[PDB]
Nucleic acid binder design. Sequence first.
RNA 1: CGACUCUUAGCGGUGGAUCACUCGGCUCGUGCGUCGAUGAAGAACGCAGCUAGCUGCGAGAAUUAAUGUGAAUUGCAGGACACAUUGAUCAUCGACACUUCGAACGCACUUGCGGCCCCGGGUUCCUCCCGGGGCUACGCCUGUCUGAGCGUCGCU
RNA 2: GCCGUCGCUGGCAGUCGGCAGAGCGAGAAAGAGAGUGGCGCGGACGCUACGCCGCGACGAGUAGGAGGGCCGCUGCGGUGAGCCUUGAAGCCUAGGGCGCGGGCCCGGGUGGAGCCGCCGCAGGUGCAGAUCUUGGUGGUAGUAGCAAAUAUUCAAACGAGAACUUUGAAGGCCGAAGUGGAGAAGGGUUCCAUGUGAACAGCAGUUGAACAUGGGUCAGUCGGUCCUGAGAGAUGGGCGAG
RNA 3: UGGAAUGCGAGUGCCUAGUGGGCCACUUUUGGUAAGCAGAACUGGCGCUGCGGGAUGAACCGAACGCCGGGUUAAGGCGCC
RNA 4: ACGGACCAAGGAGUCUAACACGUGCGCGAGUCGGGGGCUACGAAAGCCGCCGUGGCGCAAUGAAGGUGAAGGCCGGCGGCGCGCCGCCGGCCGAGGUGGGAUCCCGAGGCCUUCCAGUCCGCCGAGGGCGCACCACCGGCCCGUCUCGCCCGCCGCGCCGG
RNA 5: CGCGACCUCAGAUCAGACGUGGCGACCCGCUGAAUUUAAGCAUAUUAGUCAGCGGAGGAAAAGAAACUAACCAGGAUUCCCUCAGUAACGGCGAGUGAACAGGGAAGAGCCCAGCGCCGAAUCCCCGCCCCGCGGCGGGGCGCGGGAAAUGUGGCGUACGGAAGACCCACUCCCCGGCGCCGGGGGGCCCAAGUCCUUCUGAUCGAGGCCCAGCCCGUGGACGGUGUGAGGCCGGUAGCGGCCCCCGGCGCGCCGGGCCCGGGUCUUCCCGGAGUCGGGUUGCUUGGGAAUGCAGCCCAAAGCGGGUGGUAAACUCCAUCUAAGGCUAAAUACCGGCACGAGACCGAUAGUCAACAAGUACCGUAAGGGAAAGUUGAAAAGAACUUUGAAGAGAGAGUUCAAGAGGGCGUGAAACCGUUAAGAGGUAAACGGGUGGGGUCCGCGCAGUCCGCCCGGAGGAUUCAACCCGGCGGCGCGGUCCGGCCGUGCCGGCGGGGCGGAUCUCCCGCUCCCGUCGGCGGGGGACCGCCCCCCGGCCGGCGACCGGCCGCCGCCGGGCGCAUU
Lengths: 265, 134, 158
Amino acid sequence: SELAGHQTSAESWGTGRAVARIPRVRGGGTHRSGQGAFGNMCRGGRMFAPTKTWRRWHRRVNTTQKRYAICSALAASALPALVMSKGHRIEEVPELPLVVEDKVEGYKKTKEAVLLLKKLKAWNDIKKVYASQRMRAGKGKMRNRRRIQRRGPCVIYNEDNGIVKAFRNIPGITLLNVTKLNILKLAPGGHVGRFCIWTESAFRKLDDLYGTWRKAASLKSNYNLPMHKMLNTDLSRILKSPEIQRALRAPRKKIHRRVLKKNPL
Amino acid sequence: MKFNPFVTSDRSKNRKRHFNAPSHIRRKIMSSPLSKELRQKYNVRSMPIRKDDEVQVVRGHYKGQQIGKVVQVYRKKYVIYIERVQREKANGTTVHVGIHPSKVVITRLKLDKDRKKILERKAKSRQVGKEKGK
Amino acid sequence: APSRNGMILKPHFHKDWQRRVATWFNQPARKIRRRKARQARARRIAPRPAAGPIRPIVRCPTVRYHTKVRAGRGFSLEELRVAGIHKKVARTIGISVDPRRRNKSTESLQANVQRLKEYRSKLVLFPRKPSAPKKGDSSAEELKLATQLTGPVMPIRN
RNA sequence: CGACUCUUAGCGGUGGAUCACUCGGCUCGUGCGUCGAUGAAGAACGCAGCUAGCUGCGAGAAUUAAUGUGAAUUGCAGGACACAUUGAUCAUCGACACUUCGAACGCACUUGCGGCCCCGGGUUCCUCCCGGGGCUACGCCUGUCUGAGCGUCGCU
RNA sequence: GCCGUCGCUGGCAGUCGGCAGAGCGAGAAAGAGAGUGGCGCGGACGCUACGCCGCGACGAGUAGGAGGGCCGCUGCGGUGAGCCUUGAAGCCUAGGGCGCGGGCCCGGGUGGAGCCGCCGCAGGUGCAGAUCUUGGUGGUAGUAGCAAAUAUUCAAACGAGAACUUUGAAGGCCGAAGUGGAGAAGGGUUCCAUGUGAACAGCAGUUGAACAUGGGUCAGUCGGUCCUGAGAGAUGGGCGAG
RNA sequence: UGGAAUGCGAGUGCCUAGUGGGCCACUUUUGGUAAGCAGAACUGGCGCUGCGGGAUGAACCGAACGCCGGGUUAAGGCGCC
RNA sequence: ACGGACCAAGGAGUCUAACACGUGCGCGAGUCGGGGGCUACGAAAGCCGCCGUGGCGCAAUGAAGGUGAAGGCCGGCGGCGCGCCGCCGGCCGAGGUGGGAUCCCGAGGCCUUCCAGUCCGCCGAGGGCGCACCACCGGCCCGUCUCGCCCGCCGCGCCGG
RNA sequence: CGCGACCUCAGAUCAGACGUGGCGACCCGCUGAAUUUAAGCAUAUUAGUCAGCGGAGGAAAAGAAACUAACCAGGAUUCCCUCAGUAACGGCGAGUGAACAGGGAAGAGCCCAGCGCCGAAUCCCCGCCCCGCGGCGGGGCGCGGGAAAUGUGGCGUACGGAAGACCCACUCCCCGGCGCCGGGGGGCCCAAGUCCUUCUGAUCGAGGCCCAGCCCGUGGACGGUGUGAGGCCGGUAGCGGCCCCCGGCGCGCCGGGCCCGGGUCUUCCCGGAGUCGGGUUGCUUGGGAAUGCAGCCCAAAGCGGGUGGUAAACUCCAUCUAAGGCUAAAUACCGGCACGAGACCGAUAGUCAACAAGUACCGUAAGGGAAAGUUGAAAAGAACUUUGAAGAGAGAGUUCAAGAGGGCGUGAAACCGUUAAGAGGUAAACGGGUGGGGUCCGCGCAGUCCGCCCGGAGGAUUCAACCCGGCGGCGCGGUCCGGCCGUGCCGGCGGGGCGGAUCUCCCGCUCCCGUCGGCGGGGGACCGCCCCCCGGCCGGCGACCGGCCGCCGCCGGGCGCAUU
Ligand SMILES: [Mg+2]
Ligand SMILES: [Mg+2]
Ligand SMILES: [Mg+2]
Ligand SMILES: [Mg+2]
Ligand SMILES: [Mg+2]
Ligand SMILES: [Mg+2]
Ligand SMILES: [Mg+2]
Ligand SMILES: [Mg+2]
Ligand SMILES: [Mg+2]
Ligand SMILES: [Mg+2]
Ligand SMILES: [Mg+2]
Ligand SMILES: [Mg+2]
Ligand SMILES: [Mg+2]
Ligand SMILES: [Mg+2]
Ligand SMILES: [Mg+2]
Ligand SMILES: [Mg+2]
Ligand SMILES: [Mg+2]
Ligand SMILES: [Mg+2]
Ligand SMILES: [Mg+2]
Ligand SMILES: [Mg+2]
Ligand SMILES: [Mg+2]
Ligand SMILES: [Mg+2]
Ligand SMILES: [Mg+2]
Ligand SMILES: [Mg+2]
Ligand SMILES: [Mg+2]
Ligand SMILES: [Mg+2]
Ligand SMILES: [Mg+2]
Ligand SMILES: [Mg+2]
Ligand SMILES: [Mg+2]
Ligand SMILES: [Mg+2]
Ligand SMILES: [Mg+2]
Ligand SMILES: [Mg+2]
Ligand SMILES: [Mg+2]
Ligand SMILES: [Mg+2]
Ligand SMILES: [Mg+2]
Ligand SMILES: [Mg+2]
Ligand SMILES: [Mg+2]
Ligand SMILES: [Mg+2]
Ligand SMILES: [Mg+2]
Ligand SMILES: [Mg+2]
Ligand SMILES: [Mg+2]
Ligand SMILES: [Mg+2]
Ligand SMILES: [Mg+2]
Ligand SMILES: [Mg+2]
Ligand SMILES: [Mg+2]
Ligand SMILES: [Mg+2]
Ligand SMILES: [Mg+2]
Ligand SMILES: [Mg+2]
Ligand SMILES: [Mg+2]
Ligand SMILES: [Mg+2]
Ligand SMILES: [Mg+2]
Ligand SMILES: [Mg+2]
Ligand SMILES: [Mg+2]
Ligand SMILES: [Mg+2]
Ligand SMILES: [Mg+2]
Ligand SMILES: [Mg+2]
Ligand SMILES: [Mg+2]
Ligand SMILES: [Mg+2]
Ligand SMILES: [Mg+2]
Ligand SMILES: [Mg+2]
Ligand SMILES: [Mg+2]
Ligand SMILES: [Mg+2]
Ligand SMILES: [Mg+2]
Ligand SMILES: [Mg+2]
Ligand SMILES: [Mg+2]
Ligand SMILES: [Mg+2]
Ligand SMILES: [Mg+2]
Ligand SMILES: [Mg+2]
Ligand SMILES: [Mg+2]
Ligand SMILES: [Mg+2]
Ligand SMILES: [Mg+2]
Ligand SMILES: [Mg+2]
Ligand SMILES: [Mg+2]
Ligand SMILES: [Mg+2]
Ligand SMILES: [Mg+2]
Ligand SMILES: [Mg+2]
Ligand SMILES: [Mg+2]
Ligand SMILES: [Mg+2]
């Protein structure tokens, strides 16, 4: 409150009365009389630099960068090492990316959804979300944040014909409309490599949504994939190649430690 | 997950409305499940506990198979008093212990005109949803 | 105090500017409200166009903008007179009227006169009494195809 | 020896920090956006079987009626020929009710003085006394009634 | 000897293995070059390259600057198939250790319901001071003090209990401008009866103006009520943004 | 024949805090009887700095500092403390 | 010299705006949707492209009216007397000097029994193209001054170049 | 003198109405500082801001040009973005500071006086009759009263309007009643474990619940319940169910009102005065020879007047039409009623106020104004015995625990009592160095472990090599077959999308006589790019594989039966 600590008529007694010069409450007959006020070192006073509602809570991020961030997330989502390293149990999914037929877009019952995840071997990831359900340490419990769990697989669909309702009650699952992908969902916590599951229709719109290298995006007015700074990231193939290996001087791997000086005299 | 914009899941709002519930609401809150026999017969799962019902205690120190009659629905304290569910004070007199209605099972319902009206409505609503899934 | 090279700045914060800060935390809630009033209005006047009355073409003033045209307030009495539309009947059938505007040159006058005639050619007019058509009303066959229009009517383009 | 003093530790006090909790705040957003002479806001004083405060209510006073609800309220007691269409309790709230002051209104602010009309009891029609009921404030608009003027006129 | 800093913008992708051949520190340019004619199945560690290794020099610090913190605090997104009623946080500890340090780990005890590690995000984030704020506690200290207005004593009663209460008897004082009997203003139940002796009455108390439970103020004639005083104050009127 | 010796890697650009009371000593030096006084030059100090010595001490003399072992010193010392 | 008897808890460079430079990322002569609109977490996220209006940048200079960012060579003609100016057609062309990381050529030279002469490498006097950057000298655009001769025309001018 | 009209003005407890006061976050009209900055201070700034006064509503105000402009023109008001920290103001210092155009949100326009014409065609009130009657209205009747010619109603208002004539075309538009038909508020309800072992004071904990995977799930929000709960309860999900009430939108009947329009000609008519403008004064603005407002003086005109950002004269242009009025929306909202949320605070924090808080208490008063949360799962809140006058104790009992005993969760520090140990004349404390003693720890006290080898005792799912099967790695298979496949290159009658400031028979509207041209709207060709199809070269398969063959390795099963 802009009033916190200021709803009094406190006034400094001045010097000469053998007390600090902090402004003091007026009147008498109660405990509050003669106590310190206002200052941030006082009990019941006004804090230092009171917080303001016009703190700059919101940030602009360039569209070109936000789209970049969605391409990085999708690229990372297709590498087993990164999806494993994100904690997902995808040790038995048949392939990455995992593309399922468009029939799953029309499911209605949660049991159809649970059964599919068990046949795709995405159910060990669900069971890890159940095992990670627990209480939150700290005041978040007092503030409608009592329970915490880890994110599960992400299900990406082209059109919702009951897939959202068929999946929404399974803990950890997040649905995403392929034409409205979100970085906060594809990279929870800021870390790339969330395990995702595509329907066929969703998987076939990615080229249109973000364009290939040869063909600009069709569903974005002017966009194309971000160019590669380094085309061959296999540093070991590059270094071991004959061409580089002919230009190098022989390695100097002999270690010349310090010689203890003995007196020639 | 809850989607109704006008239903709060706030912890403190929900607790204030529980502990300040008016009597006719505390009644609904003070509901008990039915035995497997009663559940099958009436196609109802839970009933608002009432005086002269006969219940089993299924949790706590006084749990067991002893069927006792409900002798008092102390709504202010959110507890019911049951026959033989009691103990002694220092001076040796006997005093009832308060069991929460949610920790008993109703084995016989004190039936009258209004209880039957309540029972039929709950089953009629249940059967409607049954035929919605079919 | 100034310190080495720097711009000389004159911030306008010598009043009680904190008493009159206008935050924008209701912006998304304003945008929803405005949209929800556009939808309830589109339903209310359907099949009439949601955008509203058809606006005319006008050339922007000044030498900085006179190369461009845009949508004006409403068609002028000379324009409506040449197009054979009564000024009081114009608003009833989706046409906007601007008694203030003057036609200085013919070509601009003609452009709006033709715009009116094109609009009158696309107008699908429902009879006042549905069971009792009248002289100017559209045939029953072309009333089954009457659907509400989205966006400005006959958009103006440079 | 031992008192006394110091340091450390165990236990016990003084004290109420810390931690955990939160029917309270604060901030943002949304819908509505409603007081009063038909007496508002506010104030005073009363009202419970046992009740000081908080709370609610107004001499019908921790409430009446009605509707919904369907067996309590509960600290103790009690049960009206209270309690299952002879409806406990709670909720709702459209019927009825709403002491004194207060713009506050018969005049004044001391529970001080009237006046007008009607009614009832005193006695015994009038008076007179007692009691009750209704009126009796300022400004202002429309109309009404009653008037004023060596204001302007007409007929006498 | 060891720690760190700085420099060498030093070295290591050559772990090139039986599809093999181990080197390039050496005073002094550039190829351990390529050719054409005249039995066993074996061989340590390394390389979070933001990592590892080597060699040389150096190291004072207020005001001030910068770097790194696997220093610490609270909340948010991820993650730890994390911990926890077979015991969380907190608190205590002549227990065992780690780190230059900020600090941290483990043992034991108490406690009774939640907490923490890592990658990021955020901040109302680190106290010895400000005659700092609020709260608590010391020494001083069983100390200053309980000294203005002449004064008490004897016997009995109740009572666990008596210098202080009550009754009796003495001796004294106020000395009718009173320490007497009544009122106005103010107080507001302090009045009266009975009970208690926790707190209060700066010792005590069986007592009290304390506390507790109940009572008590009766009018034509006593005042108010009425009059007007100094004055205050409506309407008419005047002023006045109001 | 990079045209004296000696030593040393240089150049360059942005942003920048604190400071803007000083004080002391050899030598030189103004005012003053003089002052642990006031005011200057040069260099070095104290301030910001510990350490051995001057018993004691801001500045004197020696010497400047990571945590240590051995050796040797400086200025100063070696009756006893 | 001043504050400090003791203990706990609280306690002081924050947030908004503007600017400067440094660093990181995106795109790049462009770039930015921040306002608007479309389509539980979500008040988020996604899209617009005839929503880029607009901001900043891409042009400076002057008070302003305003103006507003390389040249040379060849041939012919005209005026003056081989040279100068005005006018016509063809050729080349965004300066140069010094330094300058890197790059390039290569006299000579890098061995094995001995001669010849090859393929790939590698060192190298000397010589080149020279990035950025700096110093210097030219040039171009706007204001002003001095000198001076011409060229244009629907307006023959107190015109314009 | 008297009577009677009107005018002006009075009195009524005359009949019927209306205003007053409060709240005030947002709004409108006034009045209005000084702290402060200028490193002093006086203009300036603070600031048209605090304080003061008045008046409202759900919004208020504003608002349909006496506007902006100077363009090829725009076209009410309000709000957002930008214009723009700009034009401008300013001891030209400190500082201050708009508008037009442009893009959006929203979008709505209208009415008088006057000039006229209509027999005042107009209105209010009273009584009776019919309908309705908790928004007091509609119709019929009254030689019922009144207002109104000092001007009510119809037409009509600057976009022009009226009247007459000729053409053309017209039947639904509303008002009061009456009946029938398809969003909002309130109530009641609707899935699934208290299954089996088990820890516990109690558990919602842990393990299990056949192939499959306890059961529901459009419900795994939240809260309660003796931990910690999708399944025990309430709820949560659901274009879920039922029941009441209000509303809205439609369809018919009765009685009413309106007797309604457009084009062209002809004749007519047309505007707001102590206001504008001017002078001066004071305030105000960015507004500068004066932006706006006000006082005083002067005081208009009618092809006039206002504006056209430097005073003034002459002159052209442009542009509006002042001095009367109404008007939703987009916009504002720290008060109110009712809700939802939060990277917020967590009892010295967060509101002063988590609680009998604007309370106790202080002040004559205006005013000032706290402290203060927590036993336990459940009161099971300690019967009874005994000492004491009692407070207090000792036993006993409840509880998992009183080592939780009614200001009781935990229970720190300072400070204090006591027990134990050590020590004590330069106050205590402190750094370095040892020493002695204690508390505990090593859960020490005949002292490590590993590989290979030698030798003794033994003992076996017995080794190598071979055969069968499976799997894997590699192959320059010097050049095996099949594949996808090149951000590769060539040939295509290849079948298409995207873009183009590259060119070009069909159509809509319009100028011209049925003709001929321009705008706008469409094919087609062309070029650049892309995808899909077919043939040829080289090309990957290490972000991208199959079949055979070969080599090697590994495993399973045989056989090897023992100097392994
Ligand atoms: Mg506070
Ligand atoms: Mg914590
Ligand atoms: Mg249920
Ligand atoms: Mg400075
Ligand atoms: Mg009472
Ligand atoms: Mg009732
Ligand atoms: Mg009832
Ligand atoms: Mg009086
Ligand atoms: Mg240092
Ligand atoms: Mg200690
Ligand atoms: Mg607890
Ligand atoms: Mg915080
Ligand atoms: Mg402190
Ligand atoms: Mg004494
Ligand atoms: Mg007396
Ligand atoms: Mg007396
Ligand atoms: Mg005493
Ligand atoms: Mg007394
Ligand atoms: Mg008497
Ligand atoms: Mg009087
Ligand atoms: Mg007066
Ligand atoms: Mg100074
Ligand atoms: Mg000196
Ligand atoms: Mg001096
Ligand atoms: Mg100093
Ligand atoms: Mg120094
Ligand atoms: Mg020194
Ligand atoms: Mg000496
Ligand atoms: Mg030494
Ligand atoms: Mg000595
Ligand atoms: Mg001082
Ligand atoms: Mg002191
Ligand atoms: Mg602290
Ligand atoms: Mg700067
Ligand atoms: Mg930058
Ligand atoms: Mg939200
Ligand atoms: Mg009256
Ligand atoms: Mg000043
Ligand atoms: Mg100052
Ligand atoms: Mg001053
Ligand atoms: Mg001002
Ligand atoms: Mg104000
Ligand atoms: Mg007021
Ligand atoms: Mg008012
Ligand atoms: Mg209102
Ligand atoms: Mg209005
Ligand atoms: Mg406008
Ligand atoms: Mg700008
Ligand atoms: Mg000046
Ligand atoms: Mg100003
Ligand atoms: Mg504009
Ligand atoms: Mg719009
Ligand atoms: Mg008229
Ligand atoms: Mg007009
Ligand atoms: Mg629970
Ligand atoms: Mg389980
Ligand atoms: Mg639960
Ligand atoms: Mg379960
Ligand atoms: Mg349910
Ligand atoms: Mg629901
Ligand atoms: Mg007008
Ligand atoms: Mg003023
Ligand atoms: Mg001003
Ligand atoms: Mg001018
Ligand atoms: Mg208005
Ligand atoms: Mg507290
Ligand atoms: Mg408090
Ligand atoms: Mg507080
Ligand atoms: Mg406290
Ligand atoms: Mg705390
Ligand atoms: Mg506590
Ligand atoms: Mg315990
Ligand atoms: Mg405890
Ligand atoms: Mg508890
Ligand atoms: Mg406590
Ligand atoms: Mg305690
Ligand atoms: Mg002790
Ligand atoms: Mg001792």
